Amino acid sequence: SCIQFTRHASDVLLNLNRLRSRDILTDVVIVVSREQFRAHKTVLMACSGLFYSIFTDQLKCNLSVINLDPEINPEGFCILLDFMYTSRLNLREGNIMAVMATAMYLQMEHVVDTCRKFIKASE
Amino acid sequence: SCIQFTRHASDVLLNLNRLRSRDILTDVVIVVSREQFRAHKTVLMACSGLFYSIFTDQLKCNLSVINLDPEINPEGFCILLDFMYTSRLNLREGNIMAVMATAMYLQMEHVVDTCRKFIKASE
């Protein structure tokens, strides 16, 4: 018999992004080919199968620094980190290959799906 | 020129609630008249003006235990904590007064608004 507030999840995500922009309560640095990205472990886990697996590990859950595979492109990661905190994906002809490869590595199934569809349309 | 994934914010909140249910990466205990509630500081801040103010304080941001005012009803808090993580509010005739008072103290403006409207309809 609950009532539901339609905009609540969006408002929560908007506030989490405000915290990220002001570097409030960020608890991890993600290192991508020497570029560094500060974030909230819980948000990373909520968006990515890879971060979910990492931060549920009894040893890795306590790390303040995570280094990604050197093949990962920092711009592709930045675009995906922005998507995690906003639901908005900056998908462009020049970045789609790097974004899809990063989303496959991060295990972000819905992003991989839209990249596959956008690539298929251009062939 | 971004594309947007409609269900992303809801999916994020659903995963944050899964983390709460399994007590994963919870970093604070909220004490309400001896009842204890584990949660994520970032989610509490994203939903409540009171928690936002508390955890942006340079001393309180580091506390692992927060004690609420003894007038706060544990059931009212529990209902609001469930709403924070799900967008669903269990508003009932028997709890509406305790839920509204707790939402006013927590500074959850949209919850206060629907409680005022539901009370006004019954008068």
């Binding site: 609950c2 009532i3 539901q4 507030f5 339609t6 | 669903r88 509010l89 949209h110 629907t114």
Partner: peptide, 4 residues
Amino acid sequence: WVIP
């Protein structure tokens, strides 16, 4: 607010 809605009935979900």
